[PDB]
Design a protein around this ligand. Structure first.
Ligand SMILES: CCc1c[nH]c2ncnc(N3CC[C@](N)(CNC(=O)c4ccc(F)cc4F)C3)c12
Ligand SMILES: [Mn+2]
Lengths: 312, 10
């Protein structure tokens, strides 16, 4: 497998380190998303260890709501990940248009996200660290796919701690902003911010300027719009506790504490995993090359890496 | 709708 094994069809995203393209594999007629990074750029921007981390996490993980990796391969100038294509686009795309999701619909995505993160933490010893609307896509049937594993921490067993200042500023957990060592409960802060955006239509702490935004995160309690039901409020309150020791999910039971919360009383977690629950929204695509759920700005448009290469 | 955010690592 090389660049010649594929046809390049549409640009889906492009973000400094490289690009994402909808491709078709010549041998099979199957469509994939190809993340194509320039080696030069990755090396120059210091993105090498993040690339290997994403490569290991993707190779090691198999879960219905995590993007599956088919191939990794390199050229002289490129590193390429060929991944399952999520034809439904980013949650960021949908919520930008719809403003808010109903509690039921936010619940469905929350449960799938919880199922994936419980898997990462408990089976794989990985903390994801960058949960956000942009890294949450919908597949052709309407199920969540988590994308973009470059910021993961690996080898994190139970409550063990980490130190890297990383993530996305609007989603950073207070213990991270405190410059404290922190554990996998940061993932449940991220879930809380995502759940908050879905049900409330805005970030719970907001300033365009990252540093003013950091002051709100550390100081202010979240506001609760009067339309939020009591189980929703309790869940958001719990996941956005600023002390991770008091956070929902912040103890030894990790995701099992969130799964038991009354906001999720309707949900049968084994059926979430088995994909037996009807998605609230099915992407209405005509074709497979139909990129209606991707932004028009896009779709209209040197070392050897030892043992990078992979096939599933 | 908020602007797209950017991931980072220090
Ligand atoms: C690459 C993640 C991915 C797996 N499966 C996909 N199916 C469709 N689109 C995907 N996209 C489109 C844009 C994306 N939603 C977010 N990531 C990026 O935009 C991105 C990240 C790093 C980079 F170098 C360039 C980028 F465009 C990924 C996927
Ligand atoms: Mn920003």
């Amino acid at each position: 497998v090389t660049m010649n094994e594929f046809e390049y069809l549409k640009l889906l995203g492009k973000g400094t380190f490289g690009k994402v393209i909808l491709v078709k594999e010549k041998a099979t007629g199957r469509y994939y998303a190809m993340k194509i990074l320039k080696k030069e750029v990755i090396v120059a921007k210091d993105e090498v260890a993040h690339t290997l981390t994403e490569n290991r996490v993707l190779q090691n993980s198999r879960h219905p709501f995590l993007t599956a990796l088919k191939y990794s391969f390199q050229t002289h100038d490129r590193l390429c990940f060929v991944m399952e294509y999520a034809n439904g686009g980013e949650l960021f795309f949908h919520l930008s248009r719809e403003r808010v999701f109903s509690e039921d619909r936010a619940r469905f995505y929350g449960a799938e996200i919880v199922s994936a993160l419980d898997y990462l933490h408990s089976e794989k010893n990985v903390v994801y660290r960058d949960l956000k609307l942009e890294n949450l896509m919908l597949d052709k049937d309407g199920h969540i796919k988590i994308t973009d594993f470059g910021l993961c921490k690996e080898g994190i067993k139970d409550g063990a701690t980490m130190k890297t200042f990383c993530g996305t500023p609007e989603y950073l957990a207070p213990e991270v902003l405190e410059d404290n060592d922190y554990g996998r409960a940061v993932d449940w802060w991220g879930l809380g911010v995502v759940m908050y955006e879905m049900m409330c239509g805005r970030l719970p702490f907001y300033n365009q300027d990252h540093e003013k935004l950091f002051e709100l995160i550390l100081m202010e309690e979240i506001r609760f719009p009067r339309t939020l039901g009591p189980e929703a409020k309790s869940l958001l309150s719990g996941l956005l506790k600023k002390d991770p020791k008091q956070r929902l999910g912040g103890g030894s039971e990790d995701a099992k504490e969130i799964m038991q919360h009354r906001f999720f009383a309707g949900i049968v977690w084994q059926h979430v995993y088995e994909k037996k629950l009807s998605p609230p929204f099915k992407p209405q695509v005509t074709s497979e090359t139909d990129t209606r759920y991707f932004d028009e700005e896009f779709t209209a448009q040197r070392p050897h890496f030892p043992q990078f290469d992979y096939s599933a | 709708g908020r602007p797209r955010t950017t991931s980072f690592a220090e």
